[PDB]
Amino acid sequence: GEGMWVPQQLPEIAGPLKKAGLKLSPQQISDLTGDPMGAVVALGGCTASFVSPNGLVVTNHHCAYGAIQLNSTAENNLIKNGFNAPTTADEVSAGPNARVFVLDEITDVTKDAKAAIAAAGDDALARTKALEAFEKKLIADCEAEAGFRCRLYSFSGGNTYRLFKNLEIKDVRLAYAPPGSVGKFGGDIDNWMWPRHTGDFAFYRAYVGKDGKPAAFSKDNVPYQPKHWLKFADQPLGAGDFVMVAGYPGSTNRYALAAEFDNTAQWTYPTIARHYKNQIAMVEAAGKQNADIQVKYAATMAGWNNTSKNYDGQLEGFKRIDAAGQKLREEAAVLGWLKGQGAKGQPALDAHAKLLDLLEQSKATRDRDLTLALFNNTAMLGSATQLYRLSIEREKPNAERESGYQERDLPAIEGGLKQLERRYVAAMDRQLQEYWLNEYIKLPADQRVAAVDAWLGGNDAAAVKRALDRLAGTKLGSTEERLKWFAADRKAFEASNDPAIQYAVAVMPTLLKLEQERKTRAGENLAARPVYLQALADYKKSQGEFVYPDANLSLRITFGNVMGYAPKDGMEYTPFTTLEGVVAKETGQDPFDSPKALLDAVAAKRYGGLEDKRIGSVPVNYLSDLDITGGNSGSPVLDAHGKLVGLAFDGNWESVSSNWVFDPKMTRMIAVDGRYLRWIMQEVYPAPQLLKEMNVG
Amino acid sequence: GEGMWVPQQLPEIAGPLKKAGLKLSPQQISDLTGDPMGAVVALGGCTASFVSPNGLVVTNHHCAYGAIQLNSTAENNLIKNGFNAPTTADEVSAGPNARVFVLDEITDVTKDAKAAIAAAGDDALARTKALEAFEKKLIADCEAEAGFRCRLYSFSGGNTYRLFKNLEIKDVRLAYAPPGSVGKFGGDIDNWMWPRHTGDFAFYRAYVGKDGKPAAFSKDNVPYQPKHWLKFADQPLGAGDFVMVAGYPGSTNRYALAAEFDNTAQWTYPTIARHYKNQIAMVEAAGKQNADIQVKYAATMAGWNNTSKNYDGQLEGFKRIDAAGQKLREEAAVLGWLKGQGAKGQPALDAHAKLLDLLEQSKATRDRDLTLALFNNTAMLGSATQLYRLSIEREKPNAERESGYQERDLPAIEGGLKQLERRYVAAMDRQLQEYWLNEYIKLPADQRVAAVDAWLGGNDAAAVKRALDRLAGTKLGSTEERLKWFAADRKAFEASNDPAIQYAVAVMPTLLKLEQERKTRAGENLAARPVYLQALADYKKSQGEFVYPDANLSLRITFGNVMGYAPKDGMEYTPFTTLEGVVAKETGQDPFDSPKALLDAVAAKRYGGLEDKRIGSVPVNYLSDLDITGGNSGSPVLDAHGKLVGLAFDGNWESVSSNWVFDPKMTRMIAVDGRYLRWIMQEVYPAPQLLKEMNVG
Ligand SMILES: [Zn+2]
Ligand SMILES: [Zn+2]
Ligand SMILES: [Zn+2]
Ligand SMILES: [Zn+2]
What we know:
Chains A, B: One of its GO terms (molecular function) is serine-type aminopeptidase activity. 2 copies of one chain form a homodimer. With 697 residues, the first copy, chain A, is of the alpha+beta class.
């Protein structure tokens, strides 16, 4: 059922957990470095878990797609073929930026954090800088232990702060991916849909130095030995059974002003979707010509497809449940409520007023802000602005450098410049720069950027064309030139005749000023958000409704039971799909082109000891009423005894609007059954070595 | 489950009926003139049943559609608005050709029929004429009692013959029809489909003379007093519960040569579907501009839509089950098995070869034969040919007149010529004449008809237009002119300058020659069909398959249980639909434009005392695994205690290929729940008088 519960809410959900079927004690789940919860790890925008005492980590194929794509060429396509390492020496690096984070400690630091914030008094910008300075000092102290990375999380609008501390494993290697026709069966046609038939799984292995401490990739590193790992279930999962997920959902917007919603529905989601589709169309074409462009842009392409379909689905789900309607009506009812109680509820009513005007403000410039952001996110302009900004920050003491530009951020910066080699083709990026310039010129005169106007030389196909021809002369296209500039000083940037770098030097003043304009808006928000959101929460508690914070990339628990749903009268989706359903979709064309070994094994009812009698086949995917969102991919699904029953990977089409307005009747998690993992690894693309290491063959 | 069982098979289904849940004794079902079976009546192409002692008859809306349409005008459109007679004097005539047939007696005449055929000797045309004379004499004797109509049925390819005697009620009046947006909710979009939300019911009343005997319409007639009628269930029908249907299915082709299937799938269904769709397009387009065409062609257009969509569904179903492959392998098995039996199999083998050759003779002229038939079925050429044929037959003694043109057929002929007034617009029929002329001209040289070629006197768009201008001069467009010709003698036809009459006179020799050919082939079939189909039956029995005859418009029993079906992996259709499903489909545009009182009542949760707590609403339609087809529409669905729980009206999309190859997993009946009949008549389009008369008031 509903809720992305923080581990500190476990007493609130103890009884609900038992009633839904948990047969572990709430005590045992509370131990976030215990069995099983100490097996659950964060990847950075996906979840995973350890499944052997030798560092084996399972997550989704689409979570590992980055890594598989980084290791793929046109002439050896791991995406298409799969990857299997018969020994640990065979495992290939997942990339310099790949991580496994292993939870170490959580601490409330709320009291201190709002003290620091208050200590700056009445100046919006100073309030932001004081929180920034508080966070940096905290993190600096927490990361003083070698091998740990820490993070500060603000919950419920800034009513609570916690500090998380993680072991940072920095050598992650690919051990197994099934072929892409299993890992992503049904492609973007089945994405966000049920019935689903997707084998969305892949395995990493986690490595440290010989001293047992984190290290970056080296051939002398050896497998991490986790304190805790998951065991596969020995009881078959069936309809109605208890399941639970722990993981790292990224963001929700369930506490929001109606105007935040209207803006998102009417503007943000339609605009982003349109832009995303336009770039897909461009890249799709060029890649039909050019297998190098196709393999190199595959990850970016999957991203654009996934987000644009999600927003299409959110827009549809709003209309289905009248979300505009509900938001209006709960806002009226909460505003009603507040004046309602006169003296006491006046702080909250003021907050509402502030927040709302802050939001008209961000609204005045939103087209400018998006367009410039995405224009600067193309490859060579991104690289030049990031690298120039780093040269600016390096002049300050580390403690004062912008987050993202401190010493602690250097590994990831340098890592990104090397990963970009596998994701960049100049003829392709030129077309994207063109696309974004065209949209820039499009902007109204009041919505323009001085420095960009001037850099460009006026508003037409001709100038666009000059820009593109000039930028084409950058040397930032090679990894070596990027890594040269990664180490160069600010003066060398200001001296450069590289046209990409000249663009950066030209606009950076504007970008820093707009960053100040954002830090100022956030500071005002920081006063007004926690009060108002605390009232939203208070009203909900007064309606007996469930109260938990919007997702914020921290660890959450969700629980429920295996069940389907009913999209329309006269029909129901069943909780499971089956092997026969995979083969019924077969067309021999992508994305419905399963391996021959699967097709033959299914036509033979070779079920490998994995059949579930109740469904008369091996289960493939399943639905449950858990409450998950982007960031939960790869999360282990555990049964009543804490055993592994599947991996979370998607939501059904009608679920995605629950980011804004939760609908219990149509919100389901889609998970890959652990018996399908097993079956694929026995009969289709075998990994007898991983099965044995997981004590299942 | 499977089976359109003849009443004489009750001994064989007694056990299975009881296992499925029947609580009436089987001998109580054996009494075909008793309770409740004596309540079930034939309408001639639909089924109905009595539901009051005062002659009230319930059937489907689509069955009464002809009669509602005949009482409809552009200005006062009962299809649109519904009809409700607050007292029995307000009932309107359903039309001169409307009938209710009440089973009186069934006689086996197999032995006498087969002796009549054998007496004819070797000659195929004499064999047909001998069976015709046999039938006519039998029927004349059986119809010696005033007010009775009799019918001879051939079963299992001519292995059994039975005669049915029915009381023939000839004054049928419309008593109630819901608005068309209930009676045909979802229109052709939801036709042949589940989920289904259609209140497909209407009521007639049956009338006789004051002396108790059948009579054509008169104000002096009074309601018929049936010996038996149905009662509404007092127990709520639920999933899994026993249901049975008795009715009059028209035809199936489950005993067929593989070549008969091949020709149907490859030529018959595509060809007819195309032709019906071409004509639908013309009539639709014209009716958009002319509300008189729209109302006058509505019943015609409902037939073309229903059949062409049925045919599309069969072709898709044949692919889903590989019906071609299944027919091929069964016939290879049966022929194997026959060869198997040396000498004693040889007559079935020779019968097979003959039936295959006769299929080839048919095929050689199939284009000509279909095209000429459907050309001559437009309104004026149909009337001219029918009436001219009648004038020829009238010069023979009655016993020798072609079936359809005997004295006993005169009331139906005359009634057709009157009904046509409400179904004909010259400017529409002209366009249909034009369509069939352009199809005729596409035929190749060996498929043309000399008499039509001469009449046409050219082969181009110009000749087509001159022919249409000539035909538009007919005076048969008026009812009075048609009835003049109904009485006129042959020389009067041959003297006429009416251009439609002249066409009829010109082509009649050719139609008579073609009829002789079909009689000759039928007479060859008479010899071969019973031997091969007996072999087919014996083969099925040796495989332990169900053995029951193909439908042939006679009374059948089917039974089973309420249950949905699974159309694909990950999905199930539930056995019921509900009121909230009707409203979920509402668009305010035909065909999804429910009466406002329905939309209000559902919004207000006015369930009228009819809610089934197990589904949380009033049920609308339901699925069951009964075995029905065309002609079963309007059949009552009875529960375990023989009480009325709904009406049969349709089958699901995947079912329709069961006409050729029975598929148990996806063959379901769609029925309208009796509770939805009641609910409409309470909350939406009220008829308290009829509810009272059925004591559910
Ligand atoms: Zn247990
Ligand atoms: Zn250089
Ligand atoms: Zn006349
Ligand atoms: Zn009972």
